[PDB]
Swiss-Prot record:
Interacts with SERK2. It comes from Oryza sativa subsp. japonica (Rice). Belongs to the protein kinase superfamily. Ser/Thr protein kinase family. This is LRR receptor-like serine/threonine-protein kinase FLS2. ATP binds at I22, G23, S24, S25, N26, L27, S28, T29, V30, K43.
Length: 288
């Protein structure tokens, strides 16, 4: 874990040039950087506008990601830490962006989307049981999945991780387990729920914002998928991402099987959700 100064990260990012910005939120701006010639992502927290939340997310991500290692996780190269001036994570640069941009001839066939599901599941199995304590990510969603130069997926953004020991919901809320959204209850099952929602979005092309129907009742993405799956393969076909090639019986059948796993992941009661190892097992069986 290398420590960097402001001047080093300024030089690496061409004085934090607007043209080097590869990601953005209220809390951080992510820049492409080049250090000996190593290409990196510089995630710079918004100290000036949100000092307290910046500090919490910075410390959480640094403490968590510095102790973890797995091929389907983002990798921390180092950090800068100068109170009032800069707090930043230096991460391995993922040249193919994030899954949200990938979703929203196309390479994203059914088999390739299933491969991403398997890669993310490996990352989450590692988080939940590969380290000395369970780590709950708490913000699993496509914009927190990065893509390699080999298009290998990696779980990123540990600013909300916990170590144990029109639309109905907009923004982030649609990915959140009800007990986490309403009560801030944290268990590995909240990642399982978010994984299910992610798979649903990956295969339908739909953000989990849901819709409020004319009688005022919300139709969640889970309920939409549940209705489609219950109507068989033709029901599933009607709900799949229209930009995705679905021509063979095998591709439709695989998509149907992912959505059925995704529905178990996104069950309302945490105790009815599988653990990620069981999820991974189902996805590995479908991969053969
Ligand atoms: N290591 C990286 N390599 C390439 N792009 C990245 C990397 N980390 C983040 N990004 C881009 O920046 C966006 C925001 O990153 P994230 O860590 O989620 O910040 P925030 O916590 O503020 O959302 C990501 O969705 C992705 O597009
Ligand atoms: Mg975040």
């Amino acid at each position: 874990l290398r420590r960097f100064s402001y001047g080093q990260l300024a030089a690496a990012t061409n004085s934090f040039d607007q043209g080097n910005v590869i990601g953005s939120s209220n809390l951080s701006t992510v820049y492409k950087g080049v250090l000996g010639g190593m290409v990196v992502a510089v995630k710079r927290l918004n100290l000036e506008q949100f000092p307290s939340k910046s500090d919490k997310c910075f410390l959480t991500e640094l403490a968590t990601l510095s102790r973890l290692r797995h091929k389907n996780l983002a990798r921390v190269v180092g950090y800068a830490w100068e109170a009032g001036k800069i707090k930043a994570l230096v991460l391995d640069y993922m040249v193919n962006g994030d899954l949200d941009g990938a979703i929203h001839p196309s390479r994203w066939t059914v088999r390739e989307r299933l491969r991403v599901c398997v890669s993310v599941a490996h990352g989450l199995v590692y988080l939940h049981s590969g380290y000395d304590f369970p780590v709950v990510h708490c913000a699993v969603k496509p914009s927190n999945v990065l893509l390699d130069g080999d298009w290998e997926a990696r779980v990123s953004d540990f600013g909300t991780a916990r170590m144990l020991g029109s639309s109905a919901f907009r923004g982030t809320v649609g990915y959140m387990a009800p007990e986490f959204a309403y009560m801030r209850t944290v268990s590995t099952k909240v990642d399982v729920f978010s994984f299910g929602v992610l798979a649903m979005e990956l295969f339908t092309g739909r953000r989990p914002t849901g819709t409020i129907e004319e009688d005022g009742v919300p139709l969640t993405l889970q309920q939409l998928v549940d209705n489609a799956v219950s109507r068989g393969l033709d029901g599933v076909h009607a709900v799949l991402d229209p930009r995705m090639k679905v021509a063979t019986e095998a591709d439709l059948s695989t998509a149907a099987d992912v959505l059925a796993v995704a529905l178990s992941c996104a069950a309302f009661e945490p105790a009815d959700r599988p653990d990620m190892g069981a999820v991974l097992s189902s996805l590995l069986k479908m991969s053969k």
